[PDB]
Amino acid sequence: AFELPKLPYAFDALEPHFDKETMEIHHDRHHNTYVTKLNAAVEGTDLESKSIEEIVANLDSVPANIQTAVRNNGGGHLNHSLFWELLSPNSEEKGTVVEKIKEQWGSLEEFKKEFADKAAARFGSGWAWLVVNNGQLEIVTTPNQDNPLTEGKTPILLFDVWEHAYYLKYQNKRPDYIGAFWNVVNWEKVDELYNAT
Amino acid sequence: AFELPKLPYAFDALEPHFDKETMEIHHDRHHNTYVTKLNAAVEGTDLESKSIEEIVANLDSVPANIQTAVRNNGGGHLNHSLFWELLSPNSEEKGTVVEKIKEQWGSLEEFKKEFADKAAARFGSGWAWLVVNNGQLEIVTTPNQDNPLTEGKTPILLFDVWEHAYYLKYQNKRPDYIGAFWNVVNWEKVDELYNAT
Ligand SMILES: [Mn+2]
Ligand SMILES: [Mn+2]
């Protein structure tokens, strides 16, 4: 059922912020593995015909015998699918959400310091998120491949803090990785996800 | 109070199984970070003069203000301290526990298949363990820096499946990493920990 989406750019398009070796392994191996395991878990079930957003939104209703496989591999597919679309080689910091962030945090620089603090604080594997929670912007972090959509919050930006996302280039220096992320955020896609709510 | 232990061997001693670049970063950065944060949690407390094993065994009675910091960083300090001692450049597959494994599983290769399967199936960051429970051996995995000692089971072998442990050499290929581990297990130390029970 589910397919590995193509990247919207070359593996080396985000250099020198994200390394081309990481982009290839992250997409062609890790994300591909999530698609493979997700297809195995939903094969022959009533989940087969559902969009991955509908599955992750309604994860709490997935049968107990496949719920962990779908939480982990469905989460992995959705989160990596959003991540590729939310990166861009020629990121401009403007648009609807940048204006909303400035209004709420006072500056982009204040927003980035809170985002970096929470992203650096996530212990073990997970994600940092900008979400809309009942019309208000919030930063949250989740473990493993958990997604805030499961708790009725709409993600508009995410950031992978699994070690596979940064180890080849940055090793233990997750703060340097978070720093490099601001250079490649696709604020056009962030706006698109925000305006859809 | 707590100090970063000295490795018992050179950073390149476990080549070609575990790369020297990883051994240096793993010990000097990741383990060092857990010691720093553990010392900040416990400074001037009761816990400051206790062994890390008694702290981690009794986590359920550490007060809520520092419980998470001690779980994560206390865990990180104990788990990495045990890991360095349980690796050797002079691994020999014999002794008390190797014989017990052969008796219980039938052969070392069947034990290794079960361990490799459970270690491969730990989703996100964590550890695979050989524990003593109810007079027999059991393979268990835990998330992040959780340690079976906290649940009253004594570990005798552990294996780090945090991506920092293998990403520079193995990238996504966790099974090849698990394969390499058998070549550097300190079965002398495994016997020491087992016979102490
Ligand atoms: Mn990832
Ligand atoms: Mn480690």
Author numbering:
A (entry chain B), B (entry chain A): 2 to 198
From the paper:
SODs detoxify superoxide, a reactive oxygen radical produced by aerobic metabolism and by the mammalian immune system in response to infection. We recently established that a Mn/Fe SOD from the bacterium Staphylococcus aureus exhibits equal activity with either manganese or iron. In addition to the camSOD (SodM), S. aureus also possesses a second, manganese-dependent SOD (SodA). All members of the Mn/Fe SOD family are related in sequence, exhibit identical protein folds, and coordinate their metal ion using identical ligands, making it unclear why some enzymes absolutely require manganese for catalysis (MnSOD), while others require iron (FeSOD), and still others show metal cofactor flexibility (camSOD).
